[PDB]
Design a protein around this motif. Sequence first.
Motif: not given
Lengths: 342, 342
Positions: B43-53, B192-201, B316-324
């Motif tokens: 059972l796939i619990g979760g797939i997480m994509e890291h922001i940092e490479q 949105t990813f942007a909105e989530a990231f903004a909160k996380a940030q 940086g890209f994420a920080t930028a998306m979050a500005l939205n």
Amino acid sequence: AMEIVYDEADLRRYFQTAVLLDHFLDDAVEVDVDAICDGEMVLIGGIMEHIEQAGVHSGDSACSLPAYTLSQEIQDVMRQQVQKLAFELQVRGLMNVQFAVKNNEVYLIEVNPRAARTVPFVSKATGVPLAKVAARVMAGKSLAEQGVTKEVIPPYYSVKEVVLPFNKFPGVDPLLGPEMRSTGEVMGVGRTFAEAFAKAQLGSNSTMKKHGRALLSVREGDKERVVDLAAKLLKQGFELDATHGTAIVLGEAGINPRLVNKVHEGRPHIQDRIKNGEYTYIINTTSGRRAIEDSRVIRRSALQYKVHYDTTLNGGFATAMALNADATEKVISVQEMHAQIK
Amino acid sequence: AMEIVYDEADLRRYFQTAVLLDHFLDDAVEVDVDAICDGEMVLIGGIMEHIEQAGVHSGDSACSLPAYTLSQEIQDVMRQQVQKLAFELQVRGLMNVQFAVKNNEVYLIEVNPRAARTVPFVSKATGVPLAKVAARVMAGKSLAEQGVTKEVIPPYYSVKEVVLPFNKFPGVDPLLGPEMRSTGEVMGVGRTFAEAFAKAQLGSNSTMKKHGRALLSVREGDKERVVDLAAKLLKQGFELDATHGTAIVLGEAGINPRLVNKVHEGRPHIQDRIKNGEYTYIINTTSGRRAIEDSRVIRRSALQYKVHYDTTLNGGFATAMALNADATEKVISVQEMHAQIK
Ligand SMILES: Nc1ncnc2c1ncn2[C@@H]1O[C@H](COP(=O)(O)OP(=O)(O)O)[C@@H](O)[C@H]1O
Ligand SMILES: Nc1ncnc2c1ncn2[C@@H]1O[C@H](COP(=O)(O)OP(=O)(O)O)[C@@H](O)[C@H]1O
Ligand SMILES: NCCC[C@H](N)C(=O)O
Ligand SMILES: NCCC[C@H](N)C(=O)O
Ligand SMILES: [Cl-]
Ligand SMILES: [K+]
Ligand SMILES: [K+]
Ligand SMILES: [K+]
Ligand SMILES: [K+]
Ligand SMILES: [Mn+2]
Ligand SMILES: [Mn+2]
């Protein structure tokens, strides 16, 4: 020969390669004065203010008759010194006196007690055949006897520009200095200084354009006035490129040129940019044997690719002013010019 | 101890101050997968994509649930791969797998046959107590038996951001890498990813602002992609400064940042400006023991001055998306969140 040493280490350096010694009057206006002395009086034939600063030979400097930035007060001082010199040296016929104006002070560069190369230009600009008059003086007829006793100040501007032979010897660094290399000259007649200079610039075969991208790469000492020249180009529609330090200085003043790499910095660099036709104008000023030898590629490419370039800030300003004129707008004949003379 | 070496020189150089050698998957997306296997199924619990490479330790990477850039096609392989592992390994209860995705290819990083530090996050995001399930499984009660058999995909974005202790240890270069240094983490939930990231940030105590001036200074490999980010910042109303190389790249693209001096370059330099609270954001990326040691002052300075900074372009890209987005626009309870899941 002639060279300008900047520091102790430069001195020995030169010496190694290498005697009168003279303080170089930096940031000074060069002026030429043509005059006639008959033993009784002195006639000012013309006061010409050079565009290029002292340090760039007068034979290679563009000049204006009448002066375009010198105060009457200071010109009056030069006029008086010429007279003092004329009488003391016992001149009889033509003479030419060269000054440097630095910080509101007049300094003497030299006295040429004979006909100088500016004599034709002055005669043309003023309607007075100086060589004809001075020759009569020399033969025995006074200025009073001839009825040529008052300095003439034309109602229009006369700008003289030169032509250099660098294009014939591409291995030579095409930059100006204390030694003369020009072969000839042209004259520009305008209602204004900008108008005369524009006609002179054009007559000299300048490839200057009224649009495009300009490359600014100036010396420390110019970094300050560059800002204004940069503003000017901007207001004209030019886009700008600049090298590191120059860019640094512009940015600080609110101007963001597009950064260009120095040849050693990487790519692409100016040579590439020039070779690829990206610029329609170049302003590159330098100072110091080493710095010169280093920047040599800018000048060389510019000349190769036929891009108009100035190697003096003073020249850049002038070029900038002419941007505001139209050399093909109006033409005048010598007879008309001389008739306008009151 | 883990380090990345780049060339022959680099390798000995290490060896000095200095065993497994592993190819370094440059410019790759890191992914974490948490799952439960009972011998019967997986059972796939979760797939997480890291922001940092990849190259920035998982524990220090912000991550997204579900993936925010990754393709379904790609997820499926990972998904397939996991399974295969879950069985081969004879996994019974929890497991975690870390992949790297380069050129649409999935590389295997490591498999952890136990409960991973991501579990609580996933559990909160998905509404499934992976911990208990796996527990029940370990004690003889199959996934089937429990009624948990199909992978849950949430209807909102869940972003995990981490908190680093660098401020407790100043002599330290507050930079990310293959070694974990974070102490804790926060969660951001959004539409949105942007909105989530903004909160996380925000949650992570970031001092990021929605205006001012940014400083951009990225590595070679990043120089290309940076243009797009610059543009984004630009759209947001920020003013830009850039160091030479970066200013070049930008310029080549149409963007003229304000040129700034590195420290050894002149005054003022970046340290000076940071110090004067000249910036609201800094994006600084680096490759090389040298380039890194050399840039140390940037990061320490920013940390010390409370300027938000990113050390990854993805970051940086994420920080930028979050500005939205606006972290304070909508609040949701966990109870509600879980209620939306089908
Ligand atoms: N002390 C000085 N300060 C600044 N420029 C000078 C100085 N002496 C000479 N020059 C520059 O060098 C040029 C040539 O000097 P000059 O004495 O007139 O030599 P020449 O006999 O070749 O005409 C001048 O036209 C001027 O630009
Ligand atoms: N081959 C690799 N290529 C790129 N990044 C890697 C590679 N191996 C590991 N990493 C990076 O280093 C981190 C640590 O690797 P890992 O084997 O998972 O160590 P740990 O035992 O600390 O969990 C990863 O989370 C990842 O960012
Ligand atoms: N009057 C001298 C010629 C000017 C030339 N464009 C230069 O500035 O070098
Ligand atoms: N997810 C790690 C924290 C991010 C930090 N601003 C950095 O980019 O170094
Ligand atoms: Cl030659
Ligand atoms: K001169
Ligand atoms: K002479
Ligand atoms: K990562
Ligand atoms: K591990
Ligand atoms: Mn002379
Ligand atoms: Mn790991």
